[PDB]
Amino acid sequence: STFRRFIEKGGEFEPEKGRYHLYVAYSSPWATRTLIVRKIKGLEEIVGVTIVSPLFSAHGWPFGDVSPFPGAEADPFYNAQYVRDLYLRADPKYEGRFTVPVLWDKKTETVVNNESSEIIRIFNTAFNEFLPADKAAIHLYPEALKSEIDEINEWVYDTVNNGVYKAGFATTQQAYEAAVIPLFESLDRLEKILTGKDYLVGDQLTEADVRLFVTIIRFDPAYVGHFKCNLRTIRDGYPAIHLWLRKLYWNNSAFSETCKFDHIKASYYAQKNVNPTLVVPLGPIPNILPL
Amino acid sequence: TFRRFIEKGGEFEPEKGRYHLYVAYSSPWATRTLIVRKIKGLEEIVGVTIVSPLFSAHGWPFGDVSPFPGAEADPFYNAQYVRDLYLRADPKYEGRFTVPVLWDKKTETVVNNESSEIIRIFNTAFNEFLPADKAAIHLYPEALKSEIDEINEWVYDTVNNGVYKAGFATTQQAYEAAVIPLFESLDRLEKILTGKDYLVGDQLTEADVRLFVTIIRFDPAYVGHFKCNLRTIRDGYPAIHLWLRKLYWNNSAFSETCKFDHIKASYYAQKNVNPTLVVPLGPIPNILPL
Ligand SMILES: O=S(=O)(O)O[C@H]1O[C@H](CO[C@H]2O[C@H](CO[C@H]3O[C@H](CO)[C@@H](OS(=O)(=O)O)[C@H](OS(=O)(=O)O)[C@H]3O)[C@@H](OS(=O)(=O)O)[C@@H](OS(=O)(=O)O)[C@@H]2O)[C@@H](OS(=O)(=O)O)[C@@H](OS(=O)(=O)O)[C@H]1OS(=O)(=O)O
Ligand SMILES: O=S(=O)(O)O[C@H]1O[C@H](CO[C@H]2O[C@H](CO[C@H]3O[C@H](CO)[C@@H](OS(=O)(=O)O)[C@H](OS(=O)(=O)O)[C@H]3O)[C@@H](OS(=O)(=O)O)[C@@H](OS(=O)(=O)O)[C@@H]2O)[C@@H](OS(=O)(=O)O)[C@@H](OS(=O)(=O)O)[C@H]1OS(=O)(=O)O
Numbered sequence: 001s002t003f004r005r006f007i008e009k010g011g012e013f014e015p016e017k018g019r020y021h022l023y024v025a026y027s028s029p030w031a032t033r034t035l036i037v038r039k040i041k042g043l044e045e046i047v048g049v050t051i052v053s054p055l056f057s058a059h060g061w062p063f064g065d066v067s068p069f070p071g072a073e074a075d076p077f078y079n080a081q082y083v084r085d086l087y088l089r090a091d092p093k094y095e096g097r098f099t100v101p102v103l104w105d106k107k108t109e110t111v112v113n114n115e116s117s118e119i120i121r122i123f124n125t126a127f128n129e130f131l132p133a134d135k136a137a138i139h140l141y142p143e144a145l146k147s148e149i150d151e152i153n154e155w156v157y158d159t160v161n162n163g164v165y166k167a168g169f170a171t172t173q174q175a176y177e178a179a180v181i182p183l184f185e186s187l188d189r190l191e192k193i194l195t196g197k198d199y200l201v202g203d204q205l206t207e208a209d210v211r212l213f214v215t216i217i218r219f220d221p222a223y224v225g226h227f228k229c230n231l232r233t234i235r236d237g238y239p240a241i242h243l244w245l246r247k248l249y250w251n252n253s254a255f256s257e258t259c260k261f262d263h264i265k266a267s268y269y270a271q272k273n274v275n276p277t278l279v280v281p282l283g284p285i286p287n288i289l290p291l
Numbered sequence: 292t293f294r295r296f297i298e299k300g301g302e303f304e305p306e307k308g309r310y311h312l313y314v315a316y317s318s319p320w321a322t323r324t325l326i327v328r329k330i331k332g333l334e335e336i337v338g339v340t341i342v343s344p345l346f347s348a349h350g351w352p353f354g355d356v357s358p359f360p361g362a363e364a365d366p367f368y369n370a371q372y373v374r375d376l377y378l379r380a381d382p383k384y385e386g387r388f389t390v391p392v393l394w395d396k397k398t399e400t401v402v403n404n405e406s407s408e409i410i411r412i413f414n415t416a417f418n419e420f421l422p423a424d425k426a427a428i429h430l431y432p433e434a435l436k437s438e439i440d441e442i443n444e445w446v447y448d449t450v451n452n453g454v455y456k457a458g459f460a461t462t463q464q465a466y467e468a469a470v471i472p473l474f475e476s477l478d479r480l481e482k483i484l485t486g487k488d489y490l491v492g493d494q495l496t497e498a499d500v501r502l503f504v505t506i507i508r509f510d511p512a513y514v515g516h517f518k519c520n521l522r523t524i525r526d527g528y529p530a531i532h533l534w535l536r537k538l539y540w541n542n543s544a545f546s547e548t549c550k551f552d553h554i555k556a557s558y559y560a561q562k563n564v565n566p567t568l569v570v571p572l573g574p575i576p577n578i579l580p581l
Contacts, residue, residue, distance in 0.1 A: 170567070172569070177572060180572055228573075229573075230515055231573035231575045232575060233523075233526070235526070236523070236525070273567075277460070277563075279460065279462070280463065281466075281470075282471070283518075283519075283521035284520055284521065
């Protein structure tokens with residue numbers, strides 16, 4: 001992701017309320033990281049959000065007027081029709097991918113940052129002056145845990161967050177197996193790390209939990225079937241992960257209110273090179289088991 | 292469209308060494324006939340050839356044409372595909388070239404290609420060639436017939452065929468119309484099997500065989516490939532799961548004829564459903580132990 005700017009006093013993007021805006025899809029785990037952290041930090045009235053349609057098209061992510069879907073929205077600001085229109089508005093010569101999330105500056109009309117790992121760090125502190133004391137104190141990447149967080153993020157990112165895509169979009173048996181086996185070795189390892197624990201790092205919520213969560217919450221509903229990540233399921237094969245996952249989802253509204261299983265399943269099962277019939281399976285039931 | 296039987300004085304006299312089964316291990320319909328062949332001890336009475344599970348543009352190939360571990364060449368006619376057997380029996384045949392085929396080596400014709408009828412043939416037609424214990428086995432006894440028929444009717448419509456209706460449906464509507472009655476019928480079977488080892492009459496019957504070939508393939512293939520995924524057998528249906536495991540692990544007719552590699556190779560090669568042709572490595576294991 002090639003827009004890697006920050007929101008800093010004296011910088012290109014001064015910290016301000018009502019200036020920065022998030023464009024996301026609910027289906028995207030990467031974009032959902034930023035929705036979760038926006039709710040954790042109480043930024044709803046400080047950073048706006050627009051939900052694009054989960055029905056990825058030949059021109060990328062459409063807005064809700066181009067591709068209607070419950071909860072999908074039109075672009076409020078530029079009559080943008082696809083997320084690529086924002087990128088091209090920011091820079092008509094842009095040649096990257098037109099991905100979500102997009103953290104957008106309404107003032108200069110450009111992309112501040114389109115790397116979810118950096119957007120959620122911006123949110124830890126950039127806006128604290130505008131927050132009540134209890135929200136401003138939250139920091140999901142604190143100094144004392146950074147190195148431990150980075151270490152677990154590195155292999156989670158490689159073998160789990162991206163591992164499910166490597167397996168699901170593999171077009172050869174060999175490439176599928178090379179992705180799916182390390183994926184489940186890493187789940188085995190996460191199962192041990194989370195045994196008897198509520199959080200991955202430091203016995204508190206950190207961005208490591210957010211980054212793992214957005215993949216694990218999509219695992220039984222979409223990755224098992226559609227991406228063939230089916231050696232076992234979270235709910236039946238990984239009790240410590242299952243418990244950690246259900247505590248986050250059911251006990252923290254930041255994780256459930258930003259989790260739209262209908263968007264999730266609609267985006268994945270409309271990937272016609274994997275699932276040409278475009279049928280959306282009705283299971284699993286439920287999307288996530290109760291505590 | 293071949294619905295003949297094997298009877299004393301009839302067109303197809305009961306004999307040892309004359310009739311031959313052509314089957315694919317992947318096919319639940321053909322596997323019915325493999326299971327009963329073993330239940331009844333017919334292995335040296337009715338021969339068997341295993342076709343390649345790698346279904347082709349020309350239908351089921353033989354093992355020399357499309358090699359796969361355990362797939363065999365046609366021993367009799369150098370047939371390349373199962374359709375070559377049908378066209379030898381009837382050059383004008385216009386049905387589907389399906390397995391199983393119960394074949395007469397003497398007159399070179401298809402006796403019967405309905406798995407539901409082949410397994411009833413195997414109940415009695417060959418008893419004169421069997422030891423007493425195998426000859427006494429009957430999977431469709433008169434006393435249980437009506438109960439077997441009743442459960443077979445909705446198992447056939449909603450479960451045996453239902454997984455296919457769900458998996459090959461090309462619209463959301465048709466997929467939902469199949470998958471919902473499938474799981475309603477699993478719910479119904481779950482109640483039937485709670486505290487029981489067999490569907491009917493507290494003994495093994497063809498009703499068990501006909502259900503087994505679907506359920507044994509459910510977690511390994513139907514859940515994923517055919518989207519039959521409201522819940523799994525092993526985690527969602529304990530009574531079915533127990534019944535299934537007792538058949539598989541305690542009756543070697545059910546395990547010796549169960550080739551999970553053939554099953555998964557055939558289904559996941561179905562390019563109109565799974566264009567990448569990738570075969571998933573899970574679920575692990577194919578069937579959980581007792
Ligand atoms: O954002 S883009 O820059 O990529 O816009 C382009 O759109 C197509 C290229 O992207 C891919 O589209 C298909 C589905 O999108 C998925 O993309 C990735 C999968 O790797 C998923 O998430 S993520 O990258 O990890 O963030 C994405 O998001 S999510 O998980 O749902 O949240 C998916 O939705 C995909 O194929 S498909 O099965 O859905 O049909 C990819 O095809 S492939 O199997 O890898 O080969 C495809 O790369 C391009 O359009 S397309 O018609 O080829 O599919 C492209 O258009 S093109 O260059 O003219 O060909 C981009 O649009 S454009 O440049 O503006 O015209
Ligand atoms: O036995 S046949 O007479 O049918 O030989 C023909 O082969 C093709 C037509 O059959 C089908 O092939 C594809 C897959 O086969 C599956 O068939 C059924 C699925 O409904 C499965 O089980 S069942 O016994 O009917 O209950 C079968 O068995 S099993 O579960 O593995 O045990 C499957 O393996 C199938 O699609 S797919 O595999 O590519 O995804 C069907 O296509 S469709 O999705 O329904 O639209 C197809 O009907 C024909 O060849 S083909 O190239 O179209 O695929 C056909 O050749 S043709 O006339 O030229 O078109 C038959 O071959 S031929 O007459 O000898 O030439």
